[PDB]
Amino acid sequence: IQTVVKRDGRIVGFNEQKIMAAIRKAMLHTDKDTTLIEQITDHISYMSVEAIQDAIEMELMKSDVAQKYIAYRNQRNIARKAKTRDVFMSIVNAKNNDITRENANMNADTPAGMMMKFASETTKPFVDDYLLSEDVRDAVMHNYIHIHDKDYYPTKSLTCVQHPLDVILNHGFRPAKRIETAAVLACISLETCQNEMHGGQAIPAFDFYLAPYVRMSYQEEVKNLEKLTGEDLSNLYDAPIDDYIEKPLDGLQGRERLEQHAINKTVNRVHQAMEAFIHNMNTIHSRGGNQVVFSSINYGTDTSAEGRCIMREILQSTYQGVGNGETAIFPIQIWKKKRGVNYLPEDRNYDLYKLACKVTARRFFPNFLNLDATFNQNEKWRADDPERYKWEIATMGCRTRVFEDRWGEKTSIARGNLSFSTINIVKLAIECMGIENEKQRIDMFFAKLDNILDITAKQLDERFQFQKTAMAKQFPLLMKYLWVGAENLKPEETIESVINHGTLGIGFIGLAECLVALIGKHHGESEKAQELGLKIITYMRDRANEFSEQYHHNYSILATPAEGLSGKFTKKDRKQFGVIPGVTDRDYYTNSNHVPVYYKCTALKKAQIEAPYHDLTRGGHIFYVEIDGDATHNPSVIESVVDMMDKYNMGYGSVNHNRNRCGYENADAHLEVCPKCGSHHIDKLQRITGYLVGTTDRWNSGKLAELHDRVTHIG
Amino acid sequence: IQTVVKRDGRIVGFNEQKIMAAIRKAMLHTDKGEDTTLIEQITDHISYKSQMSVEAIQDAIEMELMKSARKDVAQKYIAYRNQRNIARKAKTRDVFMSIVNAKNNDITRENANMNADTPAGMMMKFASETTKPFVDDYLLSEDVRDAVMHNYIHIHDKDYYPTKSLTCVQHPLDVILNHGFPAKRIETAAVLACISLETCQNEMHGGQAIPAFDFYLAPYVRMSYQEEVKNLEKLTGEDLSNLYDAPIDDYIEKPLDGLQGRERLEQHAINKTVNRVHQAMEAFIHNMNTIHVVFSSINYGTDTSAEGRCIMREILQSTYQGVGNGETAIFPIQIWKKKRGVNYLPEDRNYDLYKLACKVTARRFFPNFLNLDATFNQNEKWRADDPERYKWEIATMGCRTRVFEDRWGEKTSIARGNLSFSTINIVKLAIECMGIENEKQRIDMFFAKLDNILDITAKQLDERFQFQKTAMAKQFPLLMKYLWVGAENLKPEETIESVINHGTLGIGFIGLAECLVALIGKHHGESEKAQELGLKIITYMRDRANEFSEQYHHNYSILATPAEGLSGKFTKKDRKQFGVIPGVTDRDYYTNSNHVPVYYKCTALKKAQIEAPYHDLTRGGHIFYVEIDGDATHNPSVIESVVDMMDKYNMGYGSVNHNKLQRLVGTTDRWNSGKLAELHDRVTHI
Ligand SMILES: Nc1ncnc2c1ncn2[C@@H]1O[C@H](COP(=O)(O)OP(=O)(O)OP(=O)(O)O)[C@@H](O)[C@H]1O
Ligand SMILES: Nc1ncnc2c1ncn2[C@@H]1O[C@H](COP(=O)(O)OP(=O)(O)OP(=O)(O)O)[C@@H](O)[C@H]1O
Ligand SMILES: Nc1ncnc2c1ncn2[C@@H]1O[C@H](COP(=O)(O)OP(=O)(O)OP(=O)(O)O)[C@@H](O)[C@H]1O
Ligand SMILES: Nc1ncnc2c1ncn2[C@@H]1O[C@H](COP(=O)(O)OP(=O)(O)OP(=O)(O)O)[C@@H](O)[C@H]1O
Ligand SMILES: Nc1ccn([C@@H]2O[C@H](COP(=O)(O)OP(=O)(O)OP(=O)(O)O)[C@@H](O)[C@H]2O)c(=O)n1
Ligand SMILES: [Zn+2]
């Protein structure tokens, strides 16, 4: 009799005095009594509010009021969601708004790209309101903690993994027997697991995996040559080859001519296969919202002829380019350095190294990874045991490092990352800028940071608990072959007992402003700021270790590469607290543990100031170095940076320059008219946080100002 | 000063005492009975010309409360709005829960080629769920909304409505190869074909088709042969210059026994070229069936040169052997064009390839048959002498689509496609007129209802076309730069109004069999009045389509809609509304367009005779289906008989199937609920 729940969830009484008020309101002006209203009230008096409305309609119809009743309800039910309509119209019309450029690699104009924005915008509120806890929600609402790749939470999707590419090639999913077959199987495997993850893929040992097939190609070539001209060349199968070099046939005869011909035709096929592989991972737009698969490759630690044959071919292909002398945006290539193998002039591969340098002085790649840097070393590494690639460090895309373990064996193959979240420190500092006692200021800062860290750890543990319940069959390829503990679980079982072999990351942003917006100067010009910065980082590392010991997981600190986050906190902070000089007068925040870009400094000082942090940030780091356009010709400068890196303890590097873009990619400082193409279109090619990004139109609206303020360390 | 905008849209004014009550309610729980001391000043400060809004007041009061070092008051003042907005929603929470839990619900299974147990599938499902309600308002019209609500008109691809996307196109794979977006070897062309298909898939939401495989891939075998002979000459010093423009009857490989001098140096090159082509085709077929897989089709069969014959032989052999350890391939779609005098008679030149195709279509059923010159596929400008050209011969696209006729252009099927097609239900219109005992009145009422609904559907299609007209050039990068007919001289920031007019619009029909099983008489099988009634209905629909085309200045074509997922949709609503009817709404699915029900046993000749006259009227699409028993595998004579029967009558398409994989999809686990019963109720036409 009395059960009325007005929409929402409130439980209220049946007043019975407004059901007449509303009907009277609907008849104020419709041309067309009190008795009829009383009869309707009596009839209805004989529940869910919404439903009953329909009955009311008929009571009005059987008597100019029904049309005046549903119309108003629909006209008010539509104005309640006039905020989503604006964003939907913005997406449909494909305008350059802040909500369509959060990722500079996608293309939102195409229907495929346009179909991802709706899913992201519809799935963010769901995870916000129905999955997270209350403390985490309140922390996130106030712009303190950030969750990365939030709009994948319900899918239970991991981030990155290193591919073991020996089971796939050997057993297939038929076995390969030529160079091209393996070269295509690699691409197939890479694109069939960037559909079960939201991060990137890396291949740690290119040479050690693709070497044993050049021998098979040579054997097939010799067999064909013997078939043509009847002879017995059986002995010339296991012939020790020092190098797979090519020479013109300018005068020779007998079996030597046949052997030289076989070598030449085995080299050409490898060159073709490598070129095809490069061209395959740069145009097949097949990864999701109209993207290219995020792929990286490792090499530089092999001595056999085949390995040194593959490296030379891939480097030559990269130098040559794709198209009319253009530059390939993918894959990411990183060179591995180790004294006694590559660096010293007496070592076996020092001639391929003095080249990586020449290529990197032209095409932005490869980068350099410093092995045995006092934390990348290992104890089970024998130089005479097939140059073990298992006991070596490999780096995934966007400054990610996974090398340490606590309940297994120290390796980097068949393991990856599960999630990582970021903590804002600028707001904590600015919240305590009204005190004069420095000791109390620092103590309050530390207390607040301690408070935030526990919430972050709880959030990571909650996400891990949610991911633990995923089924095996949701990841067919990534849970049968490519993982450190697969091959012993059915497709109708959980992955609870094979998931703990992973890493969790805690990051930070703006250490060049947070701890130094409270003091006179930053860590690039004041000697005393370095001590405070190192104290903060050490405190964070100690708390991370304590959390690892507590929750039974693997926590690590990381320098978050900010792409869409470079201008997200700044706007809200400026709106709330206003404008403070040298803190929030830039529209962007300097990346983690990095000197401000707009501060002029030489390479030596920058390296010395950014060196000690790399030991603490044991989840990822980087050391950028700009170079002017006229010093991009000499491949001598990329050798300073590397020896400077080696002198101190650093584990990652790169070099960047400006590049204007028929496709005449001239590197001069400024260009007016292209030499060949008369079109005025002249774009710029550079990197944002670890990958090159097209032209200066598909960028974020907040990180573009950073590109206009970079300074050119000359070397 | 007394005006505040509100969520509901009413503006009016504020008494300003409501805020005090709200704060009191907030504070009456935290065990902190604050008096009006703070409330007086907070109200005075927050009160200070219609400039305020309900959202702004919320933020202002929250900040002021936080500044009082209370927080908890704010904590449960903001924890009440959120628990209310949740109750104002979550009526669509069960669907999301089912999707997340990965259960076998009807929502998950709509397309059998998509995987719902992967992040990409879940993302697409969320996008579809959040975009379907949007189109129902702010885009359609009131009359169209009423029509669609009452289960009359079905709009295909309604998820992609706001994206302004077309459906399908025929690839002119010659400009792409000659001028790269230039191949010099067979492998490069094989890779570029797949790259083009994959990149063009995203810009549309339908299948892709290659209209002439041989005429495009032939000119590269000769270059491969030239390279091989040049390499062999480099090996052993000889001239070998003359042996470049040497005609070859056919590339056949034989053992190198008892050969010497300049005769062993040509058979070897031929063998190498054959192996190269075989490997390239095997790579193509293996790559287009395991790359996450673009519904693709390829057409071939009307070439007479040596290179085309080699390509066809190699691809047929690769298909016969199979991909993997003897597992039948699923994609791509292979169709064999039949021409009388070039590919059919024993005296013709491609008879052996025809027999090989008939032998492959018994164990690896997939090579279909397209009958050219079937009284409507003839073209007046097709002659085989100079190039034996291909731009004036029909080319299918799979999914029963057929785009061949235009009224403001050339009669071709290259670089043209279908824009959108809707479906009209004709079973409910008959179930609602099953009470009148006077037959003539029943027929007249049915025709009137059909006229009205058809006019509504035409208006809806025109509105969708008008919406799509405004799309811009940069919407589709590759499609509108090298592919779509006249679209080669338009700026990246210009409309596509000039080129879009060459597409086609399709009006589909479904359930012609059940429409008269008991509605207006007897079954479409053992009866003679059913044929006349069906012919009258289809002719009326065709005339209406023609007058619509003359009126709105567009292209309209009748269509036999494929069962995308519309096999258990209408039947459920009909069963719920009108209840159970013997022999009408008891099979939980409707037989496809102008077909004979599968559960009705009959021979091939009967089906051919019954379904022959309908094809001439369905100029937008049609299909012929035959089933056979296991034995069929080891006897290609049955396929020859079926094809001869098709040629004797007037038809334009065909296929054969043997009754786990079955017509293509994998194991019978990703099917829709409705089609499983249909599969379980299939018979065999020996
Ligand atoms: N407290 C109530 N007790 C009984 N009937 C009510 C009550 N409030 C509203 N009704 C009846 O229910 C109808 C629902 O109208 P209304 O749209 O206001 O619903 P609601 O759920 O209260 O939401 P809202 O006020 O936000 O629109 C009112 O027109 C009136 O007929
Ligand atoms: N001026 C009006 N003209 C037409 N219909 C009206 C009018 N005012 C209210 N209604 C009808 O009354 C209902 C809306 O009621 P209203 O928005 O006044 O909330 P309410 O029921 O009084 O709220 P609550 O119970 O939450 O206090 C809908 O049925 C709407 O059609
Ligand atoms: N009529 C009013 N005029 C001015 N301020 C108001 C009025 N009603 C409420 N407020 C205050 O402004 C806030 C507006 O937020 P709120 O979401 O409650 O608005 P609303 O439109 O009244 O909500 P709902 O329709 O969901 O009941 C209220 O929390 C209260 O603090
Ligand atoms: N029990 C409660 N505890 C805490 N806050 C509450 C409680 N009930 C309501 N509020 C707060 O009061 C406001 C909700 O008010 P409500 O929607 O009932 O209408 P109102 O503010 O009186 O205005 P209107 O005249 O539009 O109905 C929100 O600020 C909500 O946070
Ligand atoms: N095409 C891309 C781009 C980057 N990454 C991943 O996306 C993250 C982006 O870094 P970050 O800026 O910290 O996160 P967001 O701000 O959310 O980046 P975005 O908005 O572009 O997603 C990186 O860790 C990288 O692994 C990726 O998998 N796919
Ligand atoms: Zn140019």
Residue numbers in the entry:
A (entry chain B): 2 to 33, 36 to 49, 55 to 71, 75 to 184, 192 to 679, 683 to 736
B (entry chain A): 2 to 49, 52 to 184, 193 to 303, 310 to 676, 705 to 708, 713 to 735
Relevant lines from the article:
RNRs produce all four deoxyribonucleotides and are the only enzymes providing de novo building blocks for DNA replication and repair in all free-living organisms. Class III RNRs, which only function anaerobically, are dimers of an α subunit (NrdD) with a stable radical close to the active site, and binding sites for allosteric nucleotides. Here, we present structural, biochemical, and biophysical studies on the ATP-cone-containing NrdD from the human pathogen Prevotella copri, showing that the binding of dATP causes increased flexibility of the C-terminal glycyl radical-bearing domain, as well as a flap-like loop that binds across the top of the active site in the active form.
As the ATP-cone density still did not permit reliable modelling, three-dimensional (3D) classification was carried out on this particle set, enabling the identification of a subset of 291,231 particles that gave a volume at 3.2 Å with better-defined ATP-cones. The ATP-cones containing the a-site are flexible, but the reconstruction from a subset of particles allowed the modelling of two ATP molecules per ATP-cone and many of the most important side chains. Strikingly, the dimer of ATP-cones is slightly offset from the dimer axis of the core protein, such that the ATP-cone of the inactive monomer approaches the core domain of the active monomer, while the ATP-cone of the active monomer is more distant from the core domain of the inactive one. Two residues from the flap make H-bonds to CTP: Asn114 to the γ-phosphate group and Asn116 to the amino group of the cytosine base. Significantly, the NxN flap forms the nexus of a network of interactions between the substrate, the linker to the ATP-cone, the C-terminal GRD, and ‘loop 2’ (residues 304–311) that is responsible for communicating the substrate specificity signal from the s-site at the dimer interface to the active site. Important interactions linking the NxN flap to the C-terminus include H-bonds from Tyr712, which immediately follows the radical Gly711, to Glu581, which bridges to both the substrate and Ala115 in the flap, as well as from Arg719 in the GRD to the main chain carbonyl groups of Asn114 and Met117 in the flap. As the NxN flap appears to close off the top of the active site, we used the web server Caver Web v1.1 to analyse substrate access to the active site in the ATP-bound form, and identified a tunnel ~12 Å long leading from the surface of the protein to the active site that is 5.6 Å in diameter at its narrowest point.
